[PDB]
Design a binder for this molecule. Sequence first.
Ligand SMILES: C[C@H](C(=O)O)c1ccc2c(c1)[nH]c1ccc(Cl)cc12
Ligand SMILES: [Ca+2]
Ligand SMILES: [Cl-]
Ligand SMILES: [Cl-]
Ligand SMILES: [Cl-]
Lengths: 365, 360
Amino acid sequence: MKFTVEREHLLKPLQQVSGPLGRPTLPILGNLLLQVADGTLSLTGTDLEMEMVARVALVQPHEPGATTVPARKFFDICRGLPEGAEIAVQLEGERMLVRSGRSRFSLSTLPAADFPNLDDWQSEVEFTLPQATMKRLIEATQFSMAHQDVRYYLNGMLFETEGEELRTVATDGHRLAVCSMPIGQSLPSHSVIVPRKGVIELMRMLDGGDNPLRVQIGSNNIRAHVGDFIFTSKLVDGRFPDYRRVLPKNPDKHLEAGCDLLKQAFARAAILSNEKFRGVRLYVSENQLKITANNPEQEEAEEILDVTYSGAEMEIGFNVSYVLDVLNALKCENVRMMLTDSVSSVQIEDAASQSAAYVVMPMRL
Amino acid sequence: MKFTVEREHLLKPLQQVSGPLPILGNLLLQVADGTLSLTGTDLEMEMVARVALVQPHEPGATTVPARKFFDICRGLPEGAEIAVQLEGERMLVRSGRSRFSLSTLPAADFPNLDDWQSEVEFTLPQATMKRLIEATQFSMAHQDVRYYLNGMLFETEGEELRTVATDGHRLAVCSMPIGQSLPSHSVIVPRKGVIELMRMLDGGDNPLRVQIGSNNIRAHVGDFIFTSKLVDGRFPDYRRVLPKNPDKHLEAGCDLLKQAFARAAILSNEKFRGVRLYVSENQLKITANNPEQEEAEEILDVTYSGAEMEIGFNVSYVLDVLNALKCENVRMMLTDSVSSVQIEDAASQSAAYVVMPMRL
Ligand SMILES: C[C@H](C(=O)O)c1ccc2c(c1)[nH]c1ccc(Cl)cc12
Ligand SMILES: [Ca+2]
Ligand SMILES: [Cl-]
Ligand SMILES: [Cl-]
Ligand SMILES: [Cl-]
């Protein structure tokens, strides 16, 4: 295996394929697989649950073969060479040599044949969509995923295809986010859970250019192709909660207000909320929202805002971090809150669109 | 105690005094003679900021939680007016229809640095003080048992102010002219003090007044006053640290040398990163290896005079120097494999660096 490649054509691929990898559990999992075949250098990184592959075209002389080498060390070497450096690589059994100018490096190898390899699988649905749509879908919901919950299915994001819609859903059992976007082709009904790190990888591979994303889903795997990057993950083997059953059934009290005005008021009140429980109290009355916070030390914050509200007065408590997370994800002019009573969840949406919806349970407070 | 002031006028003061037990997490607010003073302290140093009060106000003082008060002010909208009124065990803060009640501790409980007397005084541009500290601060010790190294020497000599910092392995010294004849004097400022002083100094052209006592230093710029205790011990004499007669001279591009060190270090021991330098006629070779038997080699074209020699260095020590220099060409002055080396910018003799070698 031999190749020579310009520094900048190797650098972003190395960064991308290292995504799935600080302290590898076993050494080969801290390595990348390098493969030269048919005019292409392929680079692969994996954590045993997902893999990221980059294809790099070779315009300079090369010889086929494969090995694995430490990802961080190889990336750092390539990054540290000067702009435009020509990076020559040659496999020499238990070592891989790297040379550029009068810089020389020898890296320890492990066999390509020992590199873990996600199984082949069969796609059952395939579709294309703009990068921006996938970005919107994930950014709208990712913050509501659980983190290290014993309920493993919640530490992932539901991807659901239905008719001409792709939908993401995330929840940690306290708050839920759901987003639906049209794709312009009719899809079979599929519902799959993508693991935490996989959602991060999908997000990371979106360059923000005009390349479309091609998605394939099977029973136990998902794959996304963007440019010369191919991401594949195993799916989480569980049954996700149904968002339709958690949306409040008849939330007739409707509040409308400016997103940023609400966000900044909640942020200020939060300063004097209980440090652990983060509770704020909302008092809604005719065209007015009062937000109060107090902590065990008896300090107090009060914010009064002009809003549009016609329903009955009520008082309801929320974890202010859950509210702030939603307002931060909406990034819109105006927000609608849909309330029922003091012991029931609130539904929050962009006043302009029902494409995303957020459900937050109240606090006893 | 009552005042009303624009948020804008509080922001910089608040960030400055939030820099240094429970009452130490509070700020002292004092209204007197048409001024609001804000003070923060950690018992070893204090920062005072003053803000003029044109709106009606009433004298008095209290202490409130620093981070809470700062976060409230910062969290209010651009252009906000902030009204404050003391109500016994609470301090009321009002802006528009935002209202806050903070718990207070009495002003009388707020720690004061003992009064002291100035012995040496001079004014210099804050830019000069920044340059002196930036040139040297990275060589201070952190939490050494030799407490006098956990800080920076400030020395006046002739017409110069000099800073010296060392951790026992490497040393930095920088001298700048201040345009007046000074007494010969030296004090050690604690490292946390150095960092707080440095953070008080922005990019402006602004006179800085320094007053040094037996046990304290004070620095005044604009409407900020920083005071710190000094460290009471015997600081090493940099003159005895500088190589006395280096007979080997290496000159190389600063950035080329930096990047070669940085690359080679990738394959050094991760827990203790060093490289070997081999100097010979017109060339520098830098090598590294690790327990996995991985190896790096860098060859540079350099200007060199002297006998061939091999010498090792701690990567971080050399990188810290080259990053501080930010110049075109660097000079290294060597003696032998077991002796310290001096490193300087080829085009400036304002700062010098000494680094002990590392055995590999
Ligand atoms: C503790 C002792 C001292 O004189 O205080 C000390 C302080 C600084 C240094 C040293 C020994 N030995 C050294 C060798 C090299 C350098 Cl750069 C600095 C030092
Ligand atoms: Ca809107
Ligand atoms: Cl190339
Ligand atoms: Cl090579
Ligand atoms: Cl004012």
